[PDB]
From a paper:
Rab proteins, the biggest subfamily within the superfamily of small GTPases, are major regulators of vesicular trafficking in eukaryotic cells. One such family of effector proteins that was reported to link Rab proteins and the cytoskeleton is the Mical (molecules interacting with CasL) family. In this publication, we present a thorough biochemical and structural analysis of a Rab effector domain termed bivalent Mical/EHBP Rab binding (bMERB) domain. The results show that the domains probably constitute a Rab8-effector family involved in endosomal trafficking, and the Rab-binding specificity can be well explained from the 3-dimensional structures of complexes determined in this work.
Well diffracting crystals were found using the RBD of Mical-cL (residues 534–683) in complex with different Rab proteins (Rab1, Rab8 and Rab10). In all structures (Rab1:Mical-cL, Rab8:Mical-cL and Rab10:Mical-cL) we found one Rab protein bound to one molecule of Mical-cL, in agreement with the previous observations that all Rab proteins tested bind only one site in Mical-cL. Most interactions were visible between the Rab proteins and α-helix 3 of Mical-cL with some additional contributing residues from α-helix 2, forming extensive contacts involving residues within switch I and II of the Rab proteins. Since the interacting residues in the RabSF1 and RabSF2 regions are strongly conserved between both Rab1 and Rab8 families, this did not explain the observed preference of the RBD towards the Rab8 family. However, we observed that the main chain atoms of the N-terminal residues preceding the RabSF1 motif can be traced in the electron density and seem to interact with amino acids within α-helix 1 and 2 of Mical-cL, even though the electron density in this region did not allow a precise localization of the side chains. In contrast to the main interacting helix α3, which adopts a similar position in all three structures, we observed slightly different orientations of the α-helices 1 and 2, adopting a position slightly further away from Rab1 compared to Rab8 and Rab10. Interestingly, whereas Rab1 contains a glutamate near the N-terminus (Glu4), all Rab8 family members contain one or (in the case of Rab10) two lysine residues in this region that point towards a negatively charged patch in Mical-cL. Consistently, the negatively charged N-terminus of Rab1 seems to repel α-helices 1 and 2 of Mical-cL and they adopt a conformation slightly further away from Rab1 compared to Rab8 and Rab10 (also see (a)). Using Mical-cL as one representative of the bMERB family, we saw that all members of the Rab8 family bound Mical-cL with high nanomolar affinities, compared to Rab1 (KD = 5.2 µM) and Rab35 (KD = 1.8 µM).
Author numbering:
A (entry chain B): -1 to 173
B (entry chain A): 531 to 575, 581 to 678
The structure:
């Protein structure tokens, strides 16, 4: 916590999506490189900070984690407006969470800035035998929207770093 | 488990900030003493060109120590907000595990209060990020 800041850009990111899809674990894996099997539902909101490097630019990411339960929708909606980028997370083993992605996209249109960047993430790719959302259908949806799409595992860390880097590069190009 | 490790890491890092701070304030104590010894010597109570070179370095050093102390104070503040947030969260999680039947009207009032303090601490952490950013923008504009 300096007086003279050694970063070039500050990007504010937001994680949204159904409860239990792994939003908090993705943040924990990215910001702290750890992982808990405990299901500790998020109370309203929280954020962590991680600094990254992109084309010679040092970029501070402020990443907001939100409760997915509908019950918290009023509380979490205040936080959409200031986001540079919003990541919508679903669970590849959970068909209904993918189904709800259309709803989460409408929450973004209602509450976020007009030009906010968006990224679609299917989490829990480690659960091989339990996967039910074909990445073909997810990818083809994302593409019809001009949205980038990635599958991740917060548990074994696959693609987690790449997900946030991809989001940051999209913002940088825009901003 | 996961929560204990996080607490341990937080505690070690507060402790280490505190250590650096303690050393800085000691060096500030010593530099101030050297400061009056130099004044006395220049005022006539070795070589005075040499004293002046010493006085010059003391001035630079007081500035260095000041900027170091101020950086550490901000870090310590940031860490206390995080520690405060964590205890609020655990206090709230515990109240919530209490089943609703035995839940007195004063319990509901305390949940609301703990929740309010938790969101305010989070808001203080966020405004600290926004303050740093403002400062970045100003320094860039000055230079
Ligand atoms: N196998 C596997 N389990 C995961 C993965 N990510 C999260 N989980 C598990 O799924 C559960 C939900 O985690 P969590 O991150 O809390 O979900 P959430 O989206 O934050 N929920 P909420 O919105 O209520 O706070 C936890 O038991 C967690 O360990 C993953 O990549 N693989
Ligand atoms: Mg969560």
């Amino acid at each position: 916590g300096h007086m003279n800041p050694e970063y070039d850009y500050l990007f504010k990111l937001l994680l949204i999506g159904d409860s239990g899809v792994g939003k908090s674990c993705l943040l924990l894996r990215f910001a702290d490189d750890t992982y808990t099997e405990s299901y500790i539902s998020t109370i309203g909101v929280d954020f962590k900070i991680r600094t990254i490097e992109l084309d010679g630019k040092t970029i501070k990411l402020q990443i907001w984690d939100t409760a997915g339960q509908e019950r918290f929708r009023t509380i979490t909606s205040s936080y959409y407006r200031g986001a540079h980028g919003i990541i919508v997370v679903y669970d590849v083993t959970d068909q209904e969470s993918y189904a709800n992605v259309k709803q989460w996209l409408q929450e973004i249109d209602r509450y976020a800035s007009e030009n906010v960047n968006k990224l679609l993430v299917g989490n829990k790719s480690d659960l091989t035998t339990k996967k039910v959302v074909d990445n073909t259908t997810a990818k083809e949806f994302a593409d019809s929207l001009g949205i980038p799409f990635l599958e991740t595992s917060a548990k074994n860390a696959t693609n987690v770093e790449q997900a946030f880097m991809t989001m940051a590069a999209e913002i940088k190009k825009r901003m | 488990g996961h929560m204990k490790q996080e607490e341990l890491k937080r505690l070690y890092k507060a402790q280490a900030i505190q250590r650096q701070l303690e050393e800085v304030e000691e060096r500030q104590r010593a530099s101030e003493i050297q400061g009056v010894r130099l004044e006395k010597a220049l005022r006539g109570e070795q070589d005075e060109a040499q004293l002046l070179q010493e006085w010059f370095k003391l001035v630079l050093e007081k500035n260095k120590l000041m900027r170091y102390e101020s950086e550490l104070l901000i870090m310590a503040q940031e860490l206390e907000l995080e520690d405060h947030q964590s205890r609020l969260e655990q206090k709230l999680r515990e109240k919530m595990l209490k089943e609703e039947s035995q839940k007195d009207e004063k319990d509901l009032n305390e949940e609301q209060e703990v929740f309010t303090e938790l969101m305010q601490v989070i808001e203080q952490r966020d405004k600290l990020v926004d303050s740093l950013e403002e400062q970045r923008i100003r320094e860039k504009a000055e230079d």
